[PDB]
Symmetry: C3
Subunit: 120 residues, 3 copies
């Protein structure tokens, strides 16, 4: 078929693939610095502002927390309702997706040269 079901506008280029949660919500970062949560019907569930572009896909944790790195150097942990659970500061931009260990530890590399292991 190949027809448009909908389009959803962000402010700048979307450089990484979206991620779909179990409840169908689609998550996508934008170069406009926001993480968007989009309902299956194309309406905005919420958006979360980081300070600079989001270059890599978000990752969804076992408990539903959404993790995303920003060019503002922080790794963000976002609750399913769109409020910030926490943010973790690294020295430079985070250009790749975090990885979650089986025991819940969040691993993320930074342009500051370190691999960080973070408690969930």
């Amino acid at each position: 078929d190949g027809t448009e079901k909908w389009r959803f506008k962000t402010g700048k280029a979307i450089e990484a693939s979206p991620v779909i949660g179990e409840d169908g919500t689609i998550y996508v970062g934008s170069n406009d610095g926001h993480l968007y949560a989009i309902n299956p019907d194309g309406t905005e569930k919420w958006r979360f502002k980081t300070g600079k572009a989001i270059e890599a896909s978000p990752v969804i944790g076992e408990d539903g927390t959404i993790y995303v790195g920003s060019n503002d150097g922080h790794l963000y942990a976002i609750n399913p309702d769109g409020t910030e659970k926490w943010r973790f500061k690294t020295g430079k931009a985070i250009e790749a997706s975090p990885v979650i260990g089986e025991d819940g530890t969040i691993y993320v590399g930074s342009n500051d040269g370190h691999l960080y292991a973070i408690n969930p």
Copy 2:
């Protein structure tokens, strides 16, 4: 061991990982703008031309359709036999792989800032 089984030429740099189909076919996009379907013995099954470089890996749907974004701005849906199923225009280059939802909807972000949801 580590010896070469074969090598397959494309015109320019290959910037994303190949993807392997159920039948063993290896799919890979090239900066020469073509999507290549390569047999396990390294001969070309087919190639599909897009207008500009392909920067992200293709994605294979459950029915075997091969989806690939192009810097020419279109998302291409290609049948296993190399014929075009459809192509979907966005405003600018598609730099990341599409993602397929459970109901089959295809999601793809574009450098034009939109997330597109496309009916398969």
Copy 3:
């Protein structure tokens, strides 16, 4: 919680996601040219030197071998103990992760424009 469990210093930016192996070891490539194997407690298990930045995530085979491409043009197969199993030369930088077929063949694209199939 959101506090640092530990951090691990490499010489330059880490551009790709880390990869957790089947024994829990964390593997990550650095722009300083090394692949690092990091224990869960944050101590270095070993590091493996390539000639130039590693831009993509390593891939781990079912037998424990770790594969990683380098901007020095080589694909490296590394044993779990950090010794080189073999090294495979391509003409130019390898910018994306390899992929392993069901028969064990290693597939990898290169900036020299070829898709290589390598015997394991």
